[PDB]
Structure formats: structure tokens, C-alpha cells
Design a protein around this ligand. Structure first.
Ligand SMILES: NC(=O)C1=CN([C@@H]2O[C@H](COP(=O)(O)OP(=O)(O)OC[C@H]3O[C@@H](n4cnc5c(N)ncnc54)[C@H](O)[C@@H]3O)[C@@H](O)[C@H]2O)C=CC1
Ligand SMILES: NC(=O)C1=CN([C@@H]2O[C@H](COP(=O)(O)OP(=O)(O)OC[C@H]3O[C@@H](n4cnc5c(N)ncnc54)[C@H](O)[C@@H]3O)[C@@H](O)[C@H]2O)C=CC1
Ligand SMILES: NC(=O)C1=CN([C@@H]2O[C@H](COP(=O)(O)OP(=O)(O)OC[C@H]3O[C@@H](n4cnc5c(N)ncnc54)[C@H](O)[C@@H]3O)[C@@H](O)[C@H]2O)C=CC1
Ligand SMILES: NC(=O)C1=CN([C@@H]2O[C@H](COP(=O)(O)OP(=O)(O)OC[C@H]3O[C@@H](n4cnc5c(N)ncnc54)[C@H](O)[C@@H]3O)[C@@H](O)[C@H]2O)C=CC1
Lengths: 280, 278, 280, 276
């Protein structure tokens, strides 16, 4: 790791929520010192830029400055901004750069087409991560581009593994991963807010209900990750005949609880596709 | 490390295994200092506890004589039969910790006080993730529990997850939230994985990613001073895929279903204990 | 202590919005009613009679409004704007700032029409709402190609006298219309229903309307003056096991949140589908 | 210049909201307010302390300090409180119960066992007193003087709207304006989500949505028009607003808000039937 990271500099095009989250996770993991990170944004009036600055992250309005001072370049902007970014800094991408795109629905092919008009063989990697990298429990996948070298995938695997789970996938899976684990934390925060409301309805202080609900979800998720058993079998171990849990599971089933979560993953994926067809 | 402490389990099922596995993984109890009892010595939970090093026996009275801290880990309608069987063996030294859903401290103390006054009783509400040391536990102290008794139980149960003392009248609501909560989460994880599979992910990857997302979000909330709505705002980029997905959850009344669940579990727990009383 | 001593304001159209702005501007003291002119082909409209009682100068002839005015508000229905611009385009001078309040109408479409008569028309696009009438409006504006920096600063100063006002990129304006432009109608519907609920439970209608409106006003003010998330302020009202958390559950059971999201989306979509029909 | 001493039994969300509102209005000095709680570790207690409010664990000290004594505890706590401090209520006291559902009759019954003629007023208010835009009603008890009702109207009018009602309206007011801020906070969160879905930054969507609701509410308070007529003035034919109003109607939006007021009122009544 020392060899990969000792003198590596990282740049963020964009200084929003994902840039802050990855920067916080990388520095908390100890892989990167905050001053070796640079972020650029046209609007300095954001709370994320303030948090990055108090972290010690170097800030600039000029994306070309971030490009000049970076080895690994994360594109942390909305999908529709990507092709305008590539036109802007494309003349500055050099052999040394690894361009890591975080946007969903922006293909490696389209990024490589843009950058290859300036210099052949751009090294491009697509990444799909989520905000819990900020506590080093992210869920990350990546796909390597046509010109990515052998050490490039291995470097990205080690970098993103320091802030959570990380595995290589074929590029065609990435938009579906966005619908599941990219959007997933928002599903979990909605559920935790509602579970806490349920606790409050039944008499619990709100502070206690939030803590218990979150701890229950965290523990159940860890249980599944550590067990070889199917989620339904773990559910069965918790639901005793005639008991409180099986009564509660019935009212979840009666509202189509499962189908709402399937609807959510699908809706996220569908939206990513229609954004992509607006560009393409 | 409580080295001088002998722990017993009346009942050798899912909860006894989860606690004993958690305790020994935390290093607070040695497996050989734990005894568990069940009338069926060929149960699969019994086998798992045996492979752990726990001492096992079919005689509930043997577990009582071995133990200082005695966990009641039987189903709720068995608690009265158990208290009658061993009540004469309860000694001054014993702390009786009932894990049974719905069973009140009053009903345990009344049954045991017929044999010996001032039984030391603690009521505990925990959940199965103690097995990976990420449980959510609350406890209430009884009439005759000393102060050190509550501090002792909090030390023990803090080693396998979050633990805090509550007034007893909150415990049925806690059961509806964190006691049944793992089952809500396993249902949600199965469904999120089906959604990933529908959109083209391999099942095994979808289960791993869905569970990791839920774990990471829960950890984010536990480590943050922010409202869960504010953390949700940070995922939801304007016009983006996430806010579109959240709309379809809202259109189905997702929030209300989870409130329904906590309510139903809490209400059933009260219903059952009303039948026990009368 | 703001007052525009050398500014003549004109309104093409003398309907709800012209009345609301003229009343807000005059109550703010930043304009005398006699320095305001409004035109409409219906001199027997109820809004025209109100403007006349304020002191506002009225005329049936749009050309007279243009000749009197420095700042010219286009306060007609969107499908009337192109006929307006053809009628008075030859009367636009260098001194004019043209401020379109019409829902959906793009700066591009206005500039194209006026530029046929005289190059470099100074155009600002504004999205406001009817509570400017009580000086609590919510307004955004976007500046056109030829609007000078002082033009936007001036309009911000003027529109800030009747409520909140900030500059936005033009492509946000249709979404603002769906939120704060249509928003007062959502609130009037909500206040009618809340009053019905109060009456069902035994309150006199006049009291229920007063309390419902006061509750909404107070809650909105709390949020504006707080750095807290609206979910956290809700938690402070929702005592465990109490009346409020029981009532919140029945709102959630009906999908209350999703209905308000549906509304904002439906307003914004309809605006875009109208402007597409106009552009084709 | 009345130099009133005010006490709160309970130092939670409503006690903080009222203390903040009263001191911001200038009617009370913070250090002339005393609040008591057995849990001296809440966020509300820390905020009261920072305001300069006097804090004590002992309800008797609050009673002895106060001229006007607010009962700002949960409804099921009120009879425990009246048993504890009933012997300390004096003829000079005005006892103002804020508790949802607790009747004047039950309060006077408890306190009359100690001194005859306890002066009792029941009030129903809401958290926006914190920004002096509260919605408050009050009802006077058997022994409250006419001056006692005038004083309470003067005091509560300093932090928002205030009017006297017959007591049998108070539980319905709770369902409308007492719980009402929670309905608005829910609506504002959802409207902001809708703004974000259509491409607005969250910070701007929150601000525009709240300003929209504030302005519309103020319009209705300053107008003699029916809310349906104000709605008609925003709704041009074929336009964006009337399309959005239709999707609200299709989901039964109106009935959800009626359901909420009713559910709050029913819960209040069923809690009181438990205590009784
Ligand atoms: N936030 C999340 O939960 C996750 C986000 N993503 C993706 O990551 C990307 C970034 O999302 P967020 O950080 O949430 O968004 P954001 O809106 O918080 O941040 C975007 C940033 O880009 C900046 N920006 C805009 N135009 C720019 C330009 N031309 N040059 C430089 N900077 C520019 C903005 O000023 C802002 O600082 C998006 O594609 C999103 O879909 C993917 C996974 C999770
Ligand atoms: N499993 C869970 O998710 C949680 C369980 N609990 C409570 O823990 C208690 C035990 O639950 P589980 O372990 O899931 O049950 P289980 O059904 O898995 O195990 C119960 C055990 O009691 C034994 N048993 C039955 N009759 C007995 C008797 N007369 N003497 C001794 N042992 C006897 C059975 O053989 C079995 O080993 C219940 O009261 C439940 O409410 C509490 C919170 C969560
Ligand atoms: N009313 C609202 O809630 C808001 C309205 N707007 C926009 O403001 C514009 C005007 O809306 P309102 O005042 O509500 O409409 P309105 O229907 O109340 O008034 C329209 C006025 O235009 C006049 N008019 C028609 N043809 C004309 C012509 N050829 N020359 C001059 N005047 C003519 C009519 O006589 C009438 O006085 C619309 O484009 C609407 O989208 C924007 C935001 C809020
Ligand atoms: N919070 C709101 O939005 C409104 C609340 N109310 C009513 O106001 C009352 C108080 O509500 P909140 O302040 O929101 O509740 P809360 O739970 O925030 O405050 C209750 C306070 O009472 C204290 N307390 C508990 N037992 C006590 C005792 N024996 N002696 C003294 N203090 C004790 C608690 O420590 C806490 O400080 C309730 O009856 C509620 O129905 C009425 C309308 C609006």
C-alpha cells in the first residue's frame, strides 16, 4: 500500500457530497493526507467546500489546477456535467492520469471517446460508491477501461477497499449497482426515520428510538454478511410461532413492503438510463 | 473479564446460542464457565453450544446450582413452569435475568417470592445480532436488584452491543423496534436483493451490496449528530436517480408500513401478556 | 429606506399578478402608485377597479404603458406573450428593462421576438407568487443576454421589497414554479381541509380557519429562522405515544408526502409541456 | 413592569419554546423564569440554562418562586405533580395547565383538597411561540378572576394569536393548531423533496417551500376571502397549478388532513379516558 499511496496525489473535479465523503474516508483510513488532496468547484458557497477546507483539503475554482496537481482524478459531478468537463480539461490529461468517473449512466466508451480526441490511450475507470465511505463502510464496485493498465485496477481496488467493500465488475452492472447500493443509503435513512417514528408512537423517547432502530439494522446487516444462510432462514430464526415478530411481518407483507423496495431499485436504474439517453 | 462469574441458560435455543457466542467472542466469559439446559439434548442449538465448549445438561436444577447469573431463555409461556420448578433452588447469590418477551418483573418476583423473599430479578430485551456483537439491548432492574447488579448486567451486555437501562414500561415498545427489527431488516434485504437481480445483478453480489449499504447507512447514522432526513438529503442529488427512487417508496407508504410493524409487534406483546395475567 | 425616484413601472396585463405586485410595491413604499401604469383590454375587470383605487394609472393601450415605463412587467397569460411582443416590439427603447413573469416563457423566445425590431433587448425572467401582495412573496429571476449587471441588481432590490428574492439559472425556473409559484394553491387547499377537520371535531369555522392558518404561518417561520432539518422540528412536536405522533401516522398511511411530491412534479411537467407546444 | 415570576413544571420542548418566546417579546426577564425537571440532562434543559432561566430538580422550588405556574409535563404526569405540590399552591398562584387532554375539573379536584378556590386556567398553544407566531387558546376555571383571564391573554398574546374559548373546544384545538406544526413540517419536507426531484438544490427548495407556505398563510389571515377563492386566483385555466391541484385531489389530500386532526383529537380523548 505504501508504494501505491506514499507519493500519490488525488484530485476531485467537483466538491460536493461524494467528494467530501471520499475525502473524509480516505484520510480517516490513513491512506491519504488531506493536503495531498485537491478539489475544484465553481461555487465556493457550499457546506461541503467548507468541510473540505477545515479538513485541510486544498480548494480551487479551476478544474485545470486540480488536473495539474493530481495522479488519480475523480470526476465527482452530475452525469450531465461530465462531457463539458472532459472538453474543458481534455487537453491537460496526460499519460500519468487515471480518470475515475463516479457518475452513473456515463459509459467508459463515451469518456474515452472524448479524451482520445486529445491524446490516445486515456486510462479510465468507472466507480460506483456511496456515502458510507465516510465511516469506512462503503459499498463500491469498479470497471476498468480499454487502456487501464494492470496496476490501475489493483490500485483502485486497494484505494477503495480502505473505505469499505470493493470488487471489480463488468461495466454493464454499474447502473444496477447504483440503484441498489448507490441509492441504498437513502432507502435506509427513510426506513430508520420511520422505524424511529414507530418507536415514538409506542412510547419511546425519540433519541432512544433512533439509536435502537439504527443498531438493529446495523446488527442485522452484519449478521447476514457473516452468515452463510439465506435471509429468509435468518428471518425464521427470529419469528417464533404466534409471536410479536411474525405479527409485525404480516403487516409488512400486507402493504407490499418487498415490492416497494424492488420498485425503488428499478426506479433508480430507470432514471439513470433516461438521463443517459438525454445525453446520448 | 469477569473470571469469577458462572453464567447459566435455562433454555438452549436461538437466544442462548446468540448470547453465549457473543459473550465468548467478546472475551468476557469462558465457554466452560457457561452451562445451558434443555429437555431435548439433540437440538441443533444444543449441538452448536456443545461445539462451543458450553457445558450442557437436561436438568434445569443443575444449571441453577452452577450459575451466579441465570438467564431465562425459554419461550414466554414456559416462564411460569420454569419458576415453579427451580424457585426453591434460587439462592441469595443469584441474579435472575429474564429475556422472555412480554414477561413482567412483577410476575417473576411474585412466583419466586413464594419460595424465598427478595429475589434479585432483571428484565432484559435483546436481539439476535448479539451473535456478532452488534446487539441492541435494554434492561430494567427489579425491586430487589442491588445497584451493582444493574452495573454488572450493563457491563456484560455492553460487550455484545449497545446496552442501556430503561424503565420497564418501555420494554414492550423496544421489542417492537429492535427486538423484531432484525426480521424487518432481513425482509428488506431479501427484497432489495430481488430488485438488484431484476435489474441484472448476480444474486450473490446483490445480497452483499444490499447488506453493505444497510450496514454503512446505519453506522453513518450512529456516528452522526445529524437527523436521518439530513443524511438522506445528502444522497439525493437534484433530479437524480436516488430522489426518483425515494418518490416510489413514498407513493407506496413505505414509512407507514414500518410504523405499522413496530406497532403490531408491540401490541401483540401486550396482548400475549394480558392472556398470561388473566 | 428604499425608493426608486427615477423609475417608472408598467404592467402589460392588469390581472391578479399585476395587482399583487403593485399593491406590494406601494405598501413597501418603494413606488408611488401614480408612477405605475397598467394596461388591459378589459377596463371593467375586478383587478382593474382595485388598481384604480390605489392610484395606479390605467389605459387600454399597451403602447401607452411602454411609452410611460422604464421597467416593463409582462403580466399576461403565457400564450398571449408572443402577441404582446409583436404589438409593442417596435416601441421598445434602449432604456427598457422587460421583465416577463409568464409561466414557462423562455428568455430565448422573448429575445428572438424583440430582436427583430431592435437589437439587444434587456430581458429578465422572473417567477414570483401572489403573496407579494402581503410582502411575503417568493421570487427568483434570471437575466437575459443583454441585461446589464445593474439591471439584475435593480430587479433584486425591487422584488426583495415584497418578499424573498434571489437570482437563479434559467433552467431552474420551471421547477420553482411548481414549488413556490403553485405552492400557495397547495396551502389554500391544505388550510381548507384542516379547517374542515377542526369543524368535524367541534370548532366554529371562523376559529378553525384562523388557528389553521396561524399554525402554518408559525411553522413556516420556525423553519425559515432555524438551522434545523424539518424532520427535527417535527420531532420536537411529537411527544411519545401522544396525539401528534398518532396523527402523523395517519398522514403517512395515506401517502401524504408523495402527494405533495406528485403536485410539484405535475405543475413543473405541465409548464414544460405548454412551452413545448408553444415552441412547436 | 409587572415584574412577574413565572414557573414551569417540566423543562422540555414547550417550556423552552414559551420561555424563548416570552423573553424575546421582552415581557419577562429570563432569570425571572424557573423551570424544574428530574432529568437535568436534556437538550431543552441546556438551552434554558444558556438562556439564563433558573433550573432546579425540585418542583416545590418552582412553585415557591412562581406567581404564574405553567404545568408543562406529559398528561399522565399531571396527577402525580398535583399530589406532590398541591400543598404548596397558594392563594396568589395562577395555575396554567398546558397538558393535552387534562380537564380543569380534574385539576381543581386535586388542588381543592388543599386550598379552596385554586385559580386554574387551561391553555393550548404550540411550538411557534418560539418565533412569536404561536396559536393559543385558553379557558378559565371556576375560581379564576376576570383579571386572571385578561393577564393570561396579555401574556400569551405577546408570542402569537390568543383568544378565550369554552373548555370543550380545547381538545379540538390541540388536533388542529397544537399538532398542526408537525403537519406543516411534514408537508415542507415533502414539498422540498418535490423541488429536488424536479432539479432544485435542497437548500433553495426548503427556503422557497417555507416562504410559499408562510406567504399563503399570511394572505389568508389578511383576507376576508374563502381559501377556495384564494386558490382560484392562483389557478389559471389549463395551467400548471390546476394540474397539480388535480393530483392532490386524486390522492384524497383533503381527507388526509381531516383524518389527522381527528386522529389527534381521538388519541387525546382516549388518553384522558385512561387516566380517568
Ligand atoms: N452523493 C451520493 O450519494 C452519490 C453520488 N454519486 C454520483 O456522484 C456524482 C456527484 O454527486 P454529489 O457529490 O452527490 O453531487 P453534488 O451536487 O453534491 O456535487 C456536485 C458538485 O459539482 C460541482 N460542479 C458543477 N459543475 C461543475 C463544473 N463544471 N466543474 C467543476 N465542478 C462542478 C458543484 O458545484 C458541486 O460542488 C453524481 O454523478 C452522483 O450521481 C454516486 C454515488 C453516491
Ligand atoms: N430469538 C429472538 O429473536 C429473541 C428472543 N427473545 C426471547 O428469548 C426467549 C427464547 O427465545 P428463542 O431462543 O428464540 O427460542 P427457541 O424456541 O429457539 O429456544 C427455546 C429453548 O427453550 C427450551 N425449553 C423448552 N421448554 C423448556 C423447559 N421446560 N425447560 C428448559 N428449557 C426448555 C427449548 O428446548 C429450546 O432449547 C423467548 O422468550 C423470546 O421471546 C428475545 C428477544 C429476541
Ligand atoms: N396568478 C398567479 O398565481 C401567478 C401568475 N403568474 C403568471 O403571471 C401571468 C399573469 O397571470 P395572472 O395575473 O394570474 O392572470 P389574469 O388572468 O388574472 O390576468 C391576465 C391579464 O391579462 C390581460 N390581457 C389579456 N390580453 C391582453 C392583451 N392583449 N394586452 C394586455 N393585457 C391583456 C387580461 O385582461 C388580464 O387583466 C401569467 O403568465 C401567469 O403564469 C406567475 C406566477 C404566479
Ligand atoms: N411540544 C408541543 O409541541 C406541545 C406540547 N403540549 C403539551 O405540553 C406538555 C409538555 O410537552 P413537551 O414539552 O413537548 O414534552 P417533553 O417530553 O419535551 O417535556 C416533559 C418534561 O417534563 C419533565 N418531567 C417528567 N416528569 C416530571 C416530574 N415528575 N416533575 C417535573 N418535571 C417532570 C421531563 O423531564 C421533561 O423535561 C404536554 O402535556 C404536551 O401535550 C401542548 C401543545 C404543543
Amino acid at each position: 500500500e505504501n508504494l501505491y499511496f506514499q507519493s500519490m496525489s488525488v484530485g476531485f473535479i467537483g466538491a460536493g457530497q461524494l467528494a467530501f465523503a471520499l475525502a473524509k474516508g480516505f484520510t480517516a483510513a490513513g491512506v491519504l493526507a488531506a493536503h495531498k488532496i485537491m478539489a475544484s468547484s465553481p461555487d465556493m458557497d457550499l457546506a461541503t467546500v467548507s468541510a473540505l477546507r477545515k479538513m485541510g483539503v486544498k480548494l480551487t475554482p479551476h478544474n485545470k489546477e486540480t488536473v495539474q496537481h493530481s495522479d488519480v482524478l475523480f470526476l465527482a459531478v452530475k452525469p450531465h456535467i461530465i462531457p463539458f468537463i472532459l472538453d474543458e480539461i481534455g487537453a491537460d490529461i496526460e499519460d500519468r492520469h487515471i480518470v475515475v468517473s463516479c457518475a452513473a449512466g456515463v459509459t467508459i466508451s463515451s469518456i474515452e471517446k472524448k479524451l482520445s480526441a486529445f491524446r490516445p490511450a486515456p486510462r479510465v475507470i468507472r466507480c460506483m460508491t456511496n456515502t458510507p465511505v465516510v465511516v469506512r463502510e462503503g459499498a463500491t464496485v469498479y470497471a476498468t477501461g480499454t487502456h487501464a493498465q494492470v496496476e490501475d485496477g489493483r490500485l483502485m481496488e486497494q484505494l477503495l477497499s480502505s473505505v469499505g467493500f470493493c470488487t471489480e465488475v463488468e461495466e454493464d452492472l454499474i447502473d444496477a449497482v447504483m440503484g441498489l447500493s448507490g441509492s441504498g443509503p437513502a432507502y435506509a435513512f427513510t426506513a430508520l426515520d420511520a422505524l424511529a417514528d414507530g418507536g415514538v408512537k409506542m412510547g419511546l423517547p425519540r433519541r432512544l428510538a433512533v439509536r435502537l432502530g439504527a443498531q438493529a439494522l446495523l446488527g442485522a446487516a452484519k449478521m447476514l454478511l457473516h452468515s452463510e444462510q439465506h435471509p429468509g432462514q435468518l428471518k425464521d430464526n427470529v419469528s417464533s410461532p404466534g409471536g410479536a415478530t411474525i405479527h409485525a411481518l404480516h403487516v409488512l407483507e400486507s402493504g407490499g413492503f418487498r415490492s416497494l423496495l424492488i420498485n425503488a431499485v428499478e426506479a433508480s436504474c430507470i432514471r439513470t438510463r433516461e438521463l443517459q439517453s438525454m445525453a446520448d
